[PDB]
Amino acid sequence: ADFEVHMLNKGKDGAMVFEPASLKVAPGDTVTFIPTDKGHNVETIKGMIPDGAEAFKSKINENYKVTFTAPGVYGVKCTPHPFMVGVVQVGDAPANLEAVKGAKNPKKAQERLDAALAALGN
């Protein structure tokens, strides 16, 4: 299956956001990150992806597609916007949950990550 995540200045969930900011996918599914507004990108957060997964980074304004196969949670961020974060999860019972959950990001960013993990049923 293929999914889209849009990058927005303001969305359903607030300002500088990925929409949706949480997505549960099956191994082999893809996500394309699509700028709806100018000035955003996506990159994996250091330490916040599964073993077996590769880090990634897009260019500002780039439509950027990633295939997710390794099970677990994937923390993503937009480089210029400190609170603009999200989580993609592959499968159930992610093994690296604490890499995201126990992290020490700015409160607004961390709340967004934590709410994403909670919405994913963790």
Say which entry of Cl ion, Cu ion, none residue 117 contacts (CB below 5 to 8 A, set by partner kind): none
Distance CA 59, CA 50 (A): 23
Pattern 15-34, Cu ion, x by CB under 5 A: -x------------------
Q: Is 40 annotated as a binding residue?
A: yes
Q: Is 81 annotated as a binding residue?
A: yes
Q: Is the peptide bond before 20 cis (omega within 30 degrees of 0)?
A: yes
Distance CA 102, CA 72 (A): 15
- For Cu ion, the binding residue among 78, 87, 88, 117 (CB under 5 A) is 78
Tokens (6 digits) for 39: 């000035």
Q: How far is the CB of 39 from Cu ion (least distance, A)?
A: 6
Say which entry of Cu ion, Cl ion, none residue 62 contacts (CB below 5 to 8 A, set by partner kind): Cl ion
Q: Which of residues 43-102 bind Cl ion (CB under 5 A)?
A: 62-63
Closest of 93, 89, 63, 67 to residue 76, by C-alpha? 89
Closest of 18, 26, 32, 28 to residue 84, by C-alpha? 18
Which one of the spans 20-28, 39-47, 66-74, 87-95 is the region binding Cu ion (CB under 5 A)?
39-47
What residue has token string 């100018």?
38
Task: Summarize as ranges the residues that interact with Cl ion (CB under 5 A).
Answer: 62-63
Task: Summarize as ranges the residues that interact with Cu ion (CB under 5 A).
Answer: 16, 40, 78, 81, 84
